[PDB]
Amino acid sequence: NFTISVTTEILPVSMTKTSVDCTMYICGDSTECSNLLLQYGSFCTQLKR
Amino acid sequence: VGYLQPRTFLLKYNENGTITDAVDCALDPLSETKCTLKSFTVEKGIYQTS
Numbered sequence: 001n002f003t004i005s006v007t008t009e010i011l012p013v014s015m016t017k018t019s020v021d022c023t024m025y026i027c028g029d030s031t032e033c034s035n036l037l038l039q040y041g042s043f044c045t046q047l048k049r
Numbered sequence: 050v051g052y053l054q055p056r057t058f059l060l061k062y063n064e065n066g067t068i069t070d071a072v073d074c075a076l077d078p079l080s081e082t083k084c085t086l087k088s089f090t091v092e093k094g095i096y097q098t099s
C-alpha cells in the first residue's frame with residue numbers, strides 16, 4: 001500500500017529595502033554639520049551606492 | 050552687467066589645458082543628475098541623489 005503526504009517548506013526571498021543619508025540622519029538642520037562633512041570629504045556616498 | 054552667486058560646478062578638462070565644456074549643479078534635474086553622478090553622459094535608470 002502507498003499513501004500521499006504533504007510537507008511545507010519556507011524560504012525567505014527579500015527584505016524591506018532601506019536607504020539612509022548623512023545630511024539628515026547625522027545632523028538635523030544645522031549647516032555646520034554639512035560644512036564639516038564637506039570639508040572631510042565623501043565618506044558615505046559609497047554607502048549610499 | 051551680471052550677478053555672481055556661490056555654488057558648485059563640475060568641469061571637464063582636456064590634455065591641451067583648455068576647458069572645452071562645463072555644466073552647473075542646480076538648474077535642472079538633468080544638471081543635478083550630472084552633478085551628483087560625477088559624469089556628463091547619464092544612462093537610463095533610477096538615481097537617488099539628494
Ligand SMILES: *[C@@H]1O[C@H](CO)[C@@H](O[C@@H]2O[C@H](CO)[C@@H](O)[C@H](O)[C@H]2NC(C)=O)[C@H](O)[C@H]1NC(C)=O
Pocket residue numbers: 001002003
Ligand atoms: C491503504 O491505506 C489506506 C489508509 O491508510 C486505506 O484507505 C482506507 O481503507 C479502508 C479499508 O481498506 C476504508 O474503510 C477507509 O475508508 C479508507 N480510507 C479512506 C478512503 O480515507 C486504503 O484502502 C489502503 N489501500 C490498500 C490497497 O490496501
